[PDB]
DNA sequence: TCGTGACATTGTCACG
DNA sequence: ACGTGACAATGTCACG
DNA sequence: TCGTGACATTGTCACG
DNA sequence: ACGTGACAATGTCACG
C-alpha cells in the first residue's frame, strides 16, 4: 500500500471522471430510462464541491459497468499524483519507430529486464566501457616479456 | 504527401468543435451568449453533412481555436494514414525520468532523433560483446594450456 | 599387539640370552655370594630343553638389573622372528659414510619422513620424473601459437 | 696404512680365542680333550702377557679358525683407527628390504658404492626442484597477468 | 608392556 | 696378507 | 484491491 | 500551411 488516499481528492477525481465520460457519450448511470438518466446526471453536476455526496451518487446511480474501469483509472491517478512530487519518480514517454522498438523489446526479453532499464544498460555498456581494442594488445605486450626473454 | 479527404477530415473538424464546446471552450468568435449558442446549436445539426461544416467554420469558429484546430487536424491526418500499415506506425514507450534524460541529452548532442540514438546504443554495445566474447575465450585457452 | 608369543620359544630365547650374557662376563643371578651364584648358573644350564623351568629360574635367581634389558632384547627377537617369514617385512642394514648419512638425515627431518622412506623418495622423484627441460620449451611453443598468430 | 700395535692387537687376538672357546669352538688344532684343554687352560693365563699369546697361537690355534681370526682382527684395526675421528667413521642405517633392493640394484648398475649412489639420488632430485620452483613460478606470473 | 626405528658392535666374505 | 664394502646377526634405547 | 509497466489516444508546440 | 518529433495528460489492461 504505497499511497495515502484521502477521499476528498480521490472523490473529486471520480467526479471529474464521471462528468468527463458523460460528455464523451457514455451511460454514466445504471438507469435504463433516459428520463431518470438525465435526472441523475444533473444531480451529479451540482455535487462538484461536495465529496461525501459523490461517493453516494456512485452507490445508487453509477453504471456498474463503469466500476472496474473507474478503479483502474483512479489507481493510475493516485500513483501519478504522488510520483509527481519529484522528478526521479515521474515517468516520461518516448514514442519511437516500430522496427527500433522491436529490436529494443527483444533485449528486454533476452535479459528479462524492464524497457526503461534496458535503455540504461545500453547507455552504460557502450558509453562507459570503451577500451577493449587496446586491452587486447597491451595484455600480449606484458605476456610477451615474461613468457619469452625476461 | 497524404491526401486530405475533406469528407472524413470535415468529420474530425466537426468533432473537435463539439468536443471543445462540451469542455467549456469558445467555439465561436463572438461575445454575448445569444448569437454564440445559436452558432453551436446550428453546428450540432451539421452532423452528417460535411460540406456545410466548413461553411460554419469560416463564419463562426473562434480565431484563437482555429490556430490549434489546424495543428490538431493536421496531426490526425499523419497518424490516420500511418496506422494503415504497422511498420509505418510508431509505438509509445515509457521511461524513468532519469533514464529519459540520459537518452535525451545523448541524442540532443549527436543531433539525431531519440529513436535514432536508441538504435545506436544497441549496436555500439553489441559491438563491444565482440570483444567480451573475444578476450574471454582467449584467456580460457590460455589457462587450458597450463 | 602384533605378535603371538608362545612361551616355549620365547622362554628358549631368554635361556640363550642368559647363558650368553653369563659367558660374556655378566652377573646373571641376583646372588651377592659367588657360591650361590655358580650354584644357580649351573641349574640354568641343565634347563636347556625345559621351558617351564626357565621362567621360574628367572623369578628366583635372575639379576633384577637384567629385567628391562632382557625385555627389550626379547621384543626385538619377536618382531624379527615374525618379520622374517617374508622378505618385504625383513629389514636390511646399509652402513654408509658419515657426511652422506648426515645429508640424508637432514631430508628425513625436513620432510618428517622415515629414512627408509626418504631413500624411496629420492629413487622416485629422480628416476621416475625426468622431463622438465623439454616441458619448459613445448609449453611456450603451444602458448606462442594461440597467444600470437592463430 | 694403519699401524698394528701388536700389544693391543695381541689383546684382541686373545679375547677372540677365549670368546670362541666359551662358545664351543675348536680353539686348538688337536683331536683329544687332553692336550686340547691344557692348551686353553694355558691360554687363559696369558691374560696380561701379549708376547706370549702369539707364541701359543703359532703352536696351538686351529688352522680352520686362524683363517677367520685374521679377517676378524684385520677388521678391528680398521674400525679401531676409524673411530679416532668422527668424520672417518661410518654409521649403520636400516632399510625396508624392498627399499634396499631398489637402491642396491641401482648402485650395482652404476658400479658405484651404496653410499655413493645415495649421494647421487639427493642431488639428482634437488636438481629437479630447480624446475619445480621454476615452471611453477612462471605459471603463477602467467595467471597474474590475466 | 609393546612395536618400532635408529643406531652400534662383532664377525665373515669376497674382491682388488 | 691387507683395507674395505657389504652384509647377518644381535643388542640397546627412546618414542608413542 | 493495488501498484505497475506497457501501450494507446488526443492535442499542442516548435521547427524546418 | 505542412509533416513531424517531442511531449503532457489521460485511460486501459494484464500481471503479480
Ligand atoms: Ca627414535
Ligand atoms: Ca662386496
Ligand atoms: Ca609405535
Ligand atoms: Ca505487463
Ligand atoms: Ca522538436
Ligand atoms: Ca507488483
Amino acid at each position: 500500500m504505497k499511497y495515502q488516499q484521502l477521499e476528498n481528492l480521490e472523490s473529486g477525481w471520480k467526479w471529474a471522471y464521471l462528468v468527463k465520460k458523460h460528455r464523451e457519450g457514455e451511460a454514466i448511470t445504471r438507469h435504463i430510462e433516459n428520463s431518470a438518466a438525465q435526472d441523475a446526471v444533473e444531480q451529479l453536476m451540482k455535487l462538484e464541491n461536495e465529496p461525501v455526496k459523490v461517493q453516494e451518487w456512485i452507490d445508487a446511480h453509477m453504471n456498474v459497468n463503469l466500476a472496474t474501469r473507474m478503479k483502474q483509472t483512479i489507481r493510475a491517478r493516485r500513483k501519478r499524483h504522488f510520483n509527481a512530487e519529484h522528478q526521479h519518480t515521474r515517468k516520461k514517454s518516448i514514442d519511437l519507430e516500430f522496427l527500433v522498438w522491436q529490436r529494443l523489446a527483444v533485449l528486454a526479453r533476452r535479459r528479462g529486464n524492464t524497457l526503461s532499464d534496458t535503455v540504461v544498460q545500453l547507455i552504460e555498456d557502450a558509453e562507459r566501457k570503451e577500451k577493449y581494442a587496446s586491452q587486447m594488445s597491451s595484455l600480449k605486450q606484458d605476456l610477451k616479456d615474461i613468457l619469452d626473454k625476461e
Side-chain angles (χ1 to χ4, degrees), chain A:
Chain A
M1 218 199 235
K2 288 137 208 182
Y3 331 80
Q4 355 290 182
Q5 37 187 305
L6 202 178
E7 263 60 72
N8 205 100
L9 58 90
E10 300 244 342
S11 153
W13 284 336
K14 25 195 67 179
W15 182 100
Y17 178 73
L18 260 7
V19 181
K20 180 184 167 185
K21 293 236 142 308
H22 185 279
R23 300 179 306 171
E24 310 180 317
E26 285 196 51
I28 308 319
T29 75
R30 86 254 249 134
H31 301 321
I32 181 62
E33 44 187 66
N34 303 339
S35 175
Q38 318 211 316
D39 276 43
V41 175
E42 277 176 4
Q43 289 201 301
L44 188 282
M45 309 283 72
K46 60 198 183 203
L47 252 56
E48 169 59 300
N49 303 71
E50 300 192 286
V52 216
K53 262 40 268 171
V54 150
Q55 183 42 48
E56 270 151 45
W57 189 91
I58 311 301
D59 292 305
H61 298 222
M62 134 138 20
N63 183 327
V64 198
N65 299 324
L66 254 176
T68 291
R69 236 142 53 215
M70 174 177 270
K71 281 190 170 67
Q72 253 170 170
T73 298
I74 299 294
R75 281 217 278 307
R77 206 105 211 168
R78 243 208 309 290
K79 187 159 151 58
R80 287 175 184 166
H81 165 87
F82 288 84
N83 288 177
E85 200 187 326
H86 293 80
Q87 294 197 316
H88 54 104
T89 42
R90 228 127 67 183
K91 50 72 202 169
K92 276 294 254 290
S93 345
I94 281 190
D95 49 15
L96 41 64
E97 292 172 8
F98 192 104
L99 181 66
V100 183
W101 161 85
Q102 184 180 58
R103 288 185 59 194
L104 200 244
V106 184
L107 294 187
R109 294 296 175 64
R110 311 211 302 99
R111 299 177 181 284
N113 312 310
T114 286
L115 280 168
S116 189
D117 282 21
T118 314
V119 170
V120 181
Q121 272 169 57
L122 311 181
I123 293 293
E124 304 179 326
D125 291 296
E127 160 159 65
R128 325 304 176 178
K129 319 171 190 177
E130 200 163 65
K131 23 275 165 183
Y132 291 119
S134 178
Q135 198 165 290
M136 166 57 141
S137 182
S138 73
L139 207 163
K140 285 188 174 181
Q141 151 71 64
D142 308 311
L143 272 173
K144 199 72 171 186
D145 292 48
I146 316 305
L147 262 175
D148 279 296
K149 307 235 83 298
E150 294 182 65

